[PDB]
Design a protein around this ligand. Structure first.
Ligand SMILES: CC(C)(COP(=O)(O)OP(=O)(O)OC[C@H]1O[C@@H](n2cnc3c(N)ncnc32)[C@H](O)[C@@H]1OP(=O)(O)O)[C@@H](O)C(=O)NCCC(=O)NCCS
Ligand SMILES: CC(C)(COP(=O)(O)OP(=O)(O)OC[C@H]1O[C@@H](n2cnc3c(N)ncnc32)[C@H](O)[C@@H]1OP(=O)(O)O)[C@@H](O)C(=O)NCCC(=O)NCCS
Ligand SMILES: CC(C)(COP(=O)(O)OP(=O)(O)OC[C@H]1O[C@@H](n2cnc3c(N)ncnc32)[C@H](O)[C@@H]1OP(=O)(O)O)[C@@H](O)C(=O)NCCC(=O)NCCS
Ligand SMILES: CC(=O)N[C@H]1[C@@H](OP(=O)(O)OP(=O)(O)OC[C@H]2O[C@@H](n3ccc(=O)[nH]c3=O)[C@H](O)[C@@H]2O)O[C@H](CO)[C@@H](O)[C@@H]1O
Ligand SMILES: CC(=O)N[C@H]1[C@@H](OP(=O)(O)OP(=O)(O)OC[C@H]2O[C@@H](n3ccc(=O)[nH]c3=O)[C@H](O)[C@@H]2O)O[C@H](CO)[C@@H](O)[C@@H]1O
Ligand SMILES: CC(=O)N[C@H]1[C@@H](OP(=O)(O)OP(=O)(O)OC[C@H]2O[C@@H](n3ccc(=O)[nH]c3=O)[C@H](O)[C@@H]2O)O[C@H](CO)[C@@H](O)[C@@H]1O
Ligand SMILES: N[C@H]1[C@@H](OP(=O)(O)O)O[C@H](CO)[C@@H](O)[C@@H]1O
Ligand SMILES: N[C@H]1[C@@H](OP(=O)(O)O)O[C@H](CO)[C@@H](O)[C@@H]1O
Ligand SMILES: N[C@H]1[C@@H](OP(=O)(O)O)O[C@H](CO)[C@@H](O)[C@@H]1O
Ligand SMILES: [Mg+2]
Ligand SMILES: [Mg+2]
Ligand SMILES: [Mg+2]
Ligand SMILES: [Mg+2]
Ligand SMILES: [Mg+2]
Ligand SMILES: [Mg+2]
Lengths: 475, 475, 475
């Protein structure tokens, strides 16, 4: 039996942000969300999050995650950030006085940490009967981490914080991951003896290691070779570095599953995105939120899709889109903007310089050029001519248009909603449609062409255009 | 005299793809094409490709490459993938029984391998009078490769496959490149003695090394320090890694020749692309296929050109284009889409939100904004006004427009093809051109403006617009 | 007291460029500009730039920099590039014969060199009373650099140039940064004894080290651990590598100050750009020149801004823009092109497929779609309908439009400048506005819609559209 505490109550000062540190995101989750998903997968008996002065802003998201993950997650409050060891004493208050399971402690800013790492921690802890097992790793650059002091036989003696280490300790490259398993009695005992004279003037959880070593208890340090799993995030440089390493792993999983990703370094894929086999993702693409891409699709370059469902065999190139769906075999882009509520049927086309908002577009229908479609329902196998506008705003309110199937509307048609265009109808180029058009009718409104001969010689005399028409009039 | 065999008959399972593995591409060639170009440059007497169950899909491309490379390339068939050593025995059947030249064996999934590496292989082989010379290299991560077993004097004894190596062998970091030169008699002899009890249950070509070592023949392993040259591709992660390393080398060659490439990591250049001196290529650009860029051009950012010829001094920014040509000093972009058959003359301009398909546009002519040009021929020094459409589709068929030189057509003009606009003609803003316009004429069709005074107070009473015109009417 | 000489007179052959090497740029300055800003910060008594045959092209920029940096910068001319040591003798001619301060020598192609590195150089030099102190560093790849010859006690004996080093010297990995402090008498003396038989047949400044060592003077070599600071640039590969390392440092500084940068590798930020706290910069963005971004902005992806001021809380996505300003809380993009002289007020919007040139757009006004705004002044809280054009070109000249506040103009309106639209006026969809529109009026010009019934059955008989209207006419 085990209780996991997540410490998330420190101020995050080095983020320099008005958004609480554990709420900063990577790969479509907050750091706190990453940490809680990983812990919930382990399924410990108790899960407690220690929050601090911003708890009003974070506690509601912890409840949302508790709901998603199907379990209870308790919140303990730490009134002032007196140190990681004081944060743990706040956390333990959310447990019963007689709790006797193990206690695991982790931070809310270690967002690649995973259930397997935690389960191995807990198995190691039990196997060696430790009073405390601490996860550690080795870094080329240990700056900022507590250093692991070991004797030549590898026995751990202490952890020493960056701010309190001598120049000689600072060269140590093995660091504390800040992830621990504890015998609860030993933990409570050691915590009650923390002192705060040290450079940060805090109650350091890391002091418990040397305290329990002095009592003669078993102190164990388990070395995690994949350092990224226990990397922490104290500022925006570390956060983008871990975002990039998480992304690399997400992309690699899709490549091994059968997705060609031309340039993994510029292809950002959020954790819940799914991609079908033999899809090719071109560079500069981000697939965000709950986007789903089918098989044999072609995506990118320079496409951003957030919660967009794309069926099989579709192409979505140079497109910026969200909360939309794109049918099988459809072609979207280059230079297309999809706003929420767009639904494009199978074999449909939304071409260059087209923007769609809150419209449904039937099977096989094409809106190929320079056109805005807003609040419209269009049927199947229809073609909307270049440079058209579904005029959905009367100056104060939004209005709907309906367009049937097999229609051929002309370039530069303005549909002044509300209007309905019947099946198989045409409009001429340049038509402003202000009333319904029956099935099979042609609607037009532009006046007759008038050619004014010699206008150019009379109104632009001496110009290059006047000289050219003078040349042609001879020749 | 030398025969080169390329083994390309395995199933490619770890690609997880419905496209045969050797047909996956990087830098604008398939892996098989890269391997065959490199071998053809060496110009061996015989060149044989061993193909397997997808041979119907690949053999035609081998013939296309034979035609391009000006030589015969034979195909041998291996009915079932019984192992690399059985693949070689299939290959040798395409040679005469009495062939006495050297035999080089390489894989179809080693796409950076180059003629110089092969020539050095063959020279090494002859110089030490080897029965077998194998190329090897050393990797930080040898996972997946056969390991090279050597005694302390560096003599090679054997190769042991990832699947068959002990934990101790697995730490070996020197690996088999899978590229070999053979005395033919020794090869045939060793092959006839392969056994398939091993973990993969295949006939391993790699067993020939320890077989020939046992016979007392000379076995030599030549170490390639540039590992990328002999890196292989078994899955999509390796394929994108080699694509990225090939790309880096292609870009570096253009930089040393005089091309500024702002960000080589996001600039993808295919192998046959040419670029002139002092061109600057901005980030996010891919130059694909047989694109040719002149000197002193400015390209990108975020431009993709496939088979596009661009003359000297031109600018092509934020443009997505293919099978087109762009004249000297022309300006294209930002946000421009060029479809096949676009030809833009010297000093021409295709501006933002413009799409061109199958049209020729003369010297000095400008299509600067929000306009679609399809199936049109336009003369020189003309200007097409913003938001125009060459209406080339009558609802069932495509039709052509012709526009002369020095014309000035108005914004929002629809050219309802087929029509001809004569030299030096104008059209007014808003004109739907349905008949020819003579040289020097002005064509118009919109009706007269009508101002309906007080409409806003009477039809939008109480609105912000009605309140503002009430304010102005006093003031 | 100290005189700094910058050697910038060599031909730059390996750049392969018609632009002088020291004029190539990174992070929005030339290499020469980077070097002179760093030196001016140190504020030496004298600062001399040695220029060569392109001096006419560079000397004017040195004067511009002298003006910016508030000091005198002298130029000495070297008629032919006879070697770095001859370049220094040209430089010293710009000093008085009796100058007695220290002389620092640096190159114009070491663009990350910084004032602190130079001040430490000069302090080291004085502290050990050196006749010559040379900066050095260690590289994995020392190719191209002079090698530092030291005895086992670390005393420097000589520098040996890439072209003149034996295979054994070439393995040395400690290299000459080409940045030196000199006692002036010792420098003049050693220079007068240079010989040019060496592989390049030049007068090498690097020979002075072994010359002064032979005279028995104190020769000191100060090792710079951050190699990038003293990296040099001889070709376009090195130049893009240093550009990328400079960029990484610029981005990291903004991240530590409170800017989220999603992907530092594809986010290019010039040195004078400023960014406010909690702004998020999405991938593929370049912020160039004197761009200024406020706090809590959202920028990118795939945005390029050059000298653009963006206020707080604004969003600028997929936008290509220069010499413009964007007010607080405004929304620009995706796919928007801003040309010089654009000024968008607070809470304004410039939407997809919109291009603006030389126009002022008031508070709260929206130009949301497919529209070109050129030479226009638009008031507050107005809305310009989709697909409109401010027609600012009469075929020979540019003309201005004025649009009031609270207006609602219709989609597909052409404003044929010069015209004025009064406050609270409307135009209908499809209007060509050729005369002023009073406050509160509705302007229209399209003709009445005409529906031609049965046109499709009579003019497209047998087509899919005719069959669909036949189906509807029953049903
Ligand atoms: C409508 C169209 C197909 C021509 O049709 P047509 O039958 O060959 O020409 P018609 O003789 O029948 O036109 C019938 C009537 O409409 C009028 N008319 C036709 N096209 C018109 C237009 N675009 N605007 C205004 N009136 C038009 C004709 O003047 C004729 O009226 P009338 O009998 O009073 O003189 C063609 O003018 C058109 O507008 N094509 C647009 C195609 C398009 O925009 N495709 C999308 C490209 S992305
Ligand atoms: C045509 C234009 C230049 C004005 O010309 P103008 O000679 O100064 O005005 P005019 O007096 O000669 O026009 C001659 C006739 O055309 C009519 N007319 C002019 N412009 C018209 C238009 N755009 N639509 C319909 N009719 C128009 C005028 O009413 C006049 O007819 P009338 O004599 O029956 O009243 C101007 O109206 C225009 O349309 N400019 C567009 C420029 C453009 O679009 N540039 C590209 C920007 S990207
Ligand atoms: C103008 C508009 C709002 C309709 O107004 P309405 O008062 O409801 O219709 P009305 O009855 O008052 O029009 C008054 C007159 O203008 C004429 N008219 C209206 N809209 C017209 C248009 N777009 N073009 C030409 N004439 C038009 C009507 O025929 C009527 O004239 P009449 O009295 O001779 O028959 C609507 O037609 C329109 O054009 N909306 C465009 C909205 C828009 O483009 N928004 C931007 C979307 S991005
Ligand atoms: C003294 C200590 O423990 N230091 C460890 C901490 O350093 P580090 O300097 O990262 O410690 P932090 O300031 O990040 O705080 C640790 C975590 O505990 C929470 N918190 C912190 C302080 C507080 O008073 N209340 C509170 O709840 C914060 O949410 C934070 O996420 O993690 C590193 C790895 O990431 C370890 O190498 C260090 O040994
Ligand atoms: C046993 C063997 O040779 N292993 C080598 C092979 O491993 P590797 O595991 O890469 O071997 P592969 O499965 O890639 O097969 C080698 C190549 O030969 C062809 N093929 C393969 C099997 C077959 O039955 N028929 C056939 O024609 C395939 O097209 C393939 O391209 O290459 C590695 C380097 O890339 C070497 O380090 C390994 O020593
Ligand atoms: C002989 C010499 O000094 N070599 C040094 C030079 O190599 P490197 O080969 O870089 O020397 P360069 O050719 O770049 O010339 C040095 C600089 O001095 C100027 N210049 C050069 C030649 C000339 O005749 N006149 C002139 O003014 C050039 O502007 C150039 O920027 O810098 C390297 C580091 O960057 C050092 O490791 C080398 O020890
Ligand atoms: N401009 C038309 C043309 O486009 P294009 O010929 O450039 O493909 O024909 C298409 C059907 O093939 C239509 O969807 C477009 O309305
Ligand atoms: N809108 C017009 C204007 O564009 P802009 O003034 O924005 O450059 O003038 C140009 C010539 O200079 C024309 O090509 C365009 O039709
Ligand atoms: N098409 C109109 C619509 O756009 P949309 O409804 O797509 O946002 O309403 C907006 C106001 O809300 C206007 O600015 C646009 O002119
Ligand atoms: Mg931390
Ligand atoms: Mg009209
Ligand atoms: Mg292989
Ligand atoms: Mg229009
Ligand atoms: Mg140099
Ligand atoms: Mg129109």
């Amino acid at each position: 039996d085990t209780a996991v505490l997540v410490l998330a109550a420190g101020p995050g000062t080095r983020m320099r942000s008005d958004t609480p540190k554990v709420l900063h995101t990577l790969a479509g989750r907050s750091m706190l969300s990453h940490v809680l998903h990983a812990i919930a997968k382990l399924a410990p008996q108790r899960l407690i999050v220690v929050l601090g002065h911003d708890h009003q802003r974070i506690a509601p998201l912890v409840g949302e995650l508790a709901d998603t993950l199907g379990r209870t997650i308790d919140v303990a409050l730490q009134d002032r950030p007196l140190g990681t060891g004081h944060a743990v004493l706040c956390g333990l208050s959310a447990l019963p006085d007689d709790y006797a399971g193990n206690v695991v402690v982790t931070s809310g800013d270690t967002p690649l940490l995973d259930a397997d790492t935690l389960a191995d921690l807990i198995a190691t802890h039990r196997a060696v009967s430790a009073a405390v097992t601490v996860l550690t790793t080795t870094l080329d650059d240990p700056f900022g981490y507590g250093r692991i002091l070991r004797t030549q036989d590898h026995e751990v003696m202490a952890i020493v914080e960056q701010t309190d280490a001598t120049p000689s300790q600072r060269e140590i490259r093995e660091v504390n991951a800040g992830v621990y398993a504890f015998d609860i009695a030993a933990l409570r005992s050691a915590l009650s003896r923390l002192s705060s004279n040290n450079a940060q003037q805090e109650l350091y959880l890391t002091d418990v290691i040397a305290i329990l070593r002095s009592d003669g208890q078993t102190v164990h340090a388990s070395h995690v070779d994949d350092s990224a799993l226990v990397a922490g995030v104290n500022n925006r440089v570390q956060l983008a570095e871990l975002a990039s390493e998480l992304n690399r792993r997400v992309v690699a999983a899709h490549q091994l599953a059968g997705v060609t990703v031309v340039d993994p370094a510029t292809t950002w894929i959020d954790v819940d995105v799914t991609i079908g086999r033999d899809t090719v993702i071109h560079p500069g693409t981000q697939l965000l939120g709950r986007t789903q891409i089918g098989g044999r699709c072609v995506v990118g370059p320079d496409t951003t899709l957030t919660d967009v469902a794309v069926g099989d065999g579709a192409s979505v190139v140079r497109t910026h889109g969200s909360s939309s769906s794109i049918g099988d075999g459809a072609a979207v882009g280059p230079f297309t903007y999809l706003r929420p509520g767009t639904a494009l049927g199978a074999d449909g086309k939304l071409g260059a310089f087209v923007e769609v908002k809150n419209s449904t577009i039937g099977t096989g229908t094409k809106v190929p050029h320079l056109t805005y479609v807003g609040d419209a329902d269009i049927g199947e196998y229809s073609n909307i001519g270049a440079s058209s506008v579904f005029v959905n705003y009367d100056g104060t309110s939004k209005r709907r248009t309906t367009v049937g199937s097999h229609v051929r509307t002309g370039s530069d048609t303005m549909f002044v909603a509300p209007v309905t265009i019947g099946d198989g109808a045409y409009t001429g180029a340049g038509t402003v449609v202000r009333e319904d058009v029956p099935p099979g009718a042609l609607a037009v409104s532009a006046g007759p062409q008038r050619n004014i001969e010699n206008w150019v010689q009379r109104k632009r005399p001496g110009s290059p255009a006047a000289q050219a028409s003078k040349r042609a009039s001879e020749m």
